[PDB]
Design a protein around this ligand. Structure first.
Ligand SMILES: *[C@@H]1O[C@H](CO)[C@@H](O)[C@H](O)[C@H]1NC(C)=O
Lengths: 42, 42, 49
């Protein structure tokens, strides 16, 4: 509905075991159409 | 090493795209009509 | 309103598919309406949206 919701979490120590639940971060009202994405690396 | 992402449908200047990035000093969120590189990096 | 006509307000007349709720579309690409290719040019098949 034109929103971009993000949930995130950080945890100090190949995907590891355990159970950690992410908490809401932000919900941006961008109102655009998305079908692809790419990652930026330094 | 991971700095952010870019979202959209076509990553040219014909449509809007969302840019989330965290450079060395600031995190910048912008939803504009970007023309993107084949291999963008920092 | 102005005398002689005010032309600062626009709307979209042609689109390929329906919008989604709270979605904005600010594109300006020529619309194909006859299955015949038209790359920028206009007339008899294609219109400014
Ligand atoms: C979003 O983009 C895709 C591909 O670019 C397109 O097929 C779809 O129709 C777009 N969204 C809407 C609501 O039309």
């Amino acid at each position: 509905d034109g929103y971009f919701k993000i949930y995130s979490k950080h945890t100090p120590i190949d995907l590891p075991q355990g159970f950690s639940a992410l908490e809401p971060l932000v919900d941006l009202p961008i109102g655009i159409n998305i079908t692809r994405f790419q990652t930026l690396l330094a | 090493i991971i700095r952010g992402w870019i979202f959209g449908t076509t990553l040219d200047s014909k449509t809007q795209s969302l840019l989330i990035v965290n450079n060395a000093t600031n995190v910048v969120i912008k939803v504009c009509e970007f023309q993107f590189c084949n291999d963008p990096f920092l | 309103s102005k005398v002689g006509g005010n032309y600062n307000y626009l709307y979209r007349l042609f689109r390929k598919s329906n919008l989604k709720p709270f979605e904005r579309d600010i594109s300006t690409e020529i619309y194909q309406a006859g299955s015949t290719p038209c790359n920028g040019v206009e007339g008899f098949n294609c219109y400014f949206p």
